[PDB]
Design a protein around this ligand. Structure first.
Ligand SMILES: CC(C)[C@H](NC(=O)[C@H](C)NC(=O)OCc1ccccc1)C(=O)N[C@@H](Cc1ccccc1)[C@@H](O)[C@H](O)[C@H](Cc1ccccc1)NC(=O)[C@@H](NC(=O)[C@H](C)NC(=O)OCc1ccccc1)C(C)C
Lengths: 99, 99
C-alpha cells in the first residue's frame, strides 16, 4: 500500500498470536510494543525518546506480521504509549518514504 | 525521492535562514526542532514521547524548505535530541509510506 500521512500511519500487526495496531514510525530505530505476553528469553534495554527514556525488554527473532507481511526481528516491550514499528522491521517489509 | 529505511531518513531543511538536518518522522504528529533562533511570537506547548513530556515553543506559519520543498507550517522548538519533521509538514511535501 501507499500510505499518506494526513493521519497516523497505523497498521494492524500480529505478534505472539495477538492482534495489535501499531504506528509505522520512520523516526523509530527499533520496534516498541506495549506490555504484552511474549514467549521466550529477553535482555534489558533502554530506549530514548522525547523527554525520557524507558527500560524495555528486548526480544530477538520474534515473528511479526505487519499488514500481511511476515517478518522476524527484534521487538522491544515496555511502557510505551503506542505500539511502534521501527525501521528495523519496516526495512523487512520494504517500506520507503516517498515524495 | 524514494527513501528506504535502512538508515534514519535524514533530510536537510532550511528554516529561519539556517540549515539543519532533520528526521522525516512518520511517528511524529508535529515538527520539533532543537533550540534555534526563530523570529516572531510563540505559544507554550508540550509534546509527549517515549518516557517523558517536554515543553516546547509553538511557532505557527513558519517557512521551511524540506529537501527542496518549501512548506509553511507549525514548528515546535525545544530540548529535543533530534530535529524531527512530523506529519504536519510531511503531508505538505506529499510524503507517503510505501510498501
Ligand atoms: C520509539 C523510540 C525507540 C524512538 N527512539 C529511537 O528510535 C531512538 C533514536 N533510538 C534509540 O533509543 O536507540 C537506543 C539508544 C540511543 C542512544 C543511546 C543509547 C541507546 C523515539 O522515541 N523516537 C522519537 C523521536 C526521537 C528521535 C531521536 C532521539 C530520541 C527521540 C520519534 O521519532 C518517534 O516517532 C515517536 C513515536 C511515538 C509515537 C507515539 C508515542 C510515543 C512515541 N514520536 C514522538 O515521540 C513524538 N511525540 C508525539 O507525536 C506525541 C504522541 N504527541 C504529542 O505529544 O502531541 C502533543 C500532545 C499534547 C498533549 C496531549 C496529547 C498530545 C514527537 C517526536 C513529536
Amino acid at each position: 500500500p501507499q500510505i499518506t500521512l494526513w493521519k497516523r500511519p497505523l497498521v494492524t500487526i500480529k505478534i505472539g498470536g495477538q492482534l495489535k495496531e501499531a504506528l509505522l514510525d520512520t523516526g523509530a530505530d527499533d520496534t516498541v510494543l506495549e506490555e504484552m505476553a511474549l514467549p521466550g528469553k529477553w535482555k534489558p534495554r533502554m530506549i530514548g525518546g522525547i523527554g525520557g527514556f524507558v527500560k524495555v525488554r528486548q526480544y530477538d527473532q520474534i515473528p511479526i506480521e505487519i499488514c500481511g507481511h511476515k517478518v522476524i526481528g527484534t521487538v522491544l516491550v515496555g511502557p510505551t504509549p503506542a505500539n511502534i514499528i521501527g525501521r528495523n522491521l519496516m526495512t523487512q517489509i520494504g517500506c520507503t518514504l516517498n515524495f
